[PDB]
Copies of this chain bind each other. A is one copy, B any other.
Amino acid sequence: GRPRAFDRDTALQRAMDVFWVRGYEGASLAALTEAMEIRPPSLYAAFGSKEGLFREALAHYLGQHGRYRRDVLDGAPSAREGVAELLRETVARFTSDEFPRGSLVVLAALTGTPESEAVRDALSAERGESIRLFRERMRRGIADGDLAADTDMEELATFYATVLFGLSVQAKDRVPRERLLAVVERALRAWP
């Protein structure tokens, strides 16, 4: 029939940016439909609802900013170099302006009304996946021999995840890239 005037993945990209800056509940459909360059009935045709548009923008954000994480981790010769390389590239992405500062998963919905709890729980489970990414790379380190067998991998993974999440708050606070890279270097001194 009549052709579609927008490109799906491009409207999904602009919806992702608005969420990245205003958050899930902070993003009105006025601001969204303005960014995507579509009209409300077009938006609800492709995405179902505001929540459905966020879940698709989350999957979009993740595939474009959450797959580079495991590539850097497993591409390093040791678990310590993986955590170092991934924390350094994260600080780079957190401090260049090709994107907004900080991670969408950390910033988009930490608190809110009871109505948007499903969205908040989604971002919560995704933060647990960051811990799992760390913990999985440490399991390889113990097997490769570069990490002691009696290492508390859950504590080490959670510690560096705490630092990872904290860097989103610091990047949003406009802390310079040089100071964030010193945080990463200092956090590595805690390695066993």
Contact = CB atoms under 8 A, between A and B. Distances in A.
A39 to B, nearest CB: 21
Interface size range on A against B: 35 or more
Contacts of A107: 110-111
A164 interface: yes
Interface in A150-192: 152, 154-156, 158-159, 161-167, 169-170, 172-173, 175, 179-180, 182-183, 186-190
Copies of the chain in the assembly: 2
Interface stretch (A23-31, A41-49, A59-67, A134-142): A23-31
Given A154-B179, A175-B158, A23 B111 contact: yes
Contact of A25 (B25, B163, B172, B182): B25
A129 to B, nearest CB: 12
A164 B25 CA distance: 25
Interface string A55-76: 0000000000000000000000
A112 to B, nearest CB: 4
A106 to B, nearest CB: 6
Interface in A105-125: 106-108, 110-114, 116, 124
A25 to B, nearest CB: 6
Given A165-B169, A165-B170, A166-B169, A113 B22 contact: yes
A110 B163 contact: no
Q: Which one of A108, A111, A173, A179 has the greatest number of beta carbons of chain B within 10 Å? A: A111
A162 B183 contact: yes
17 contacts: A22-B112, A26-B113, A28-B113, A31-B113, A106-B110, A108-B111, A124-B172, A124-B173, A152-B182, A155-B179, A156-B186, A158-B180, A159-B182, A162-B163, A165-B165, A189-B189, A189-B190
Which 4 pairs from chain A and chain B are nearest by CB? A166-B166, A23-B111, A162-B166, A26-B112
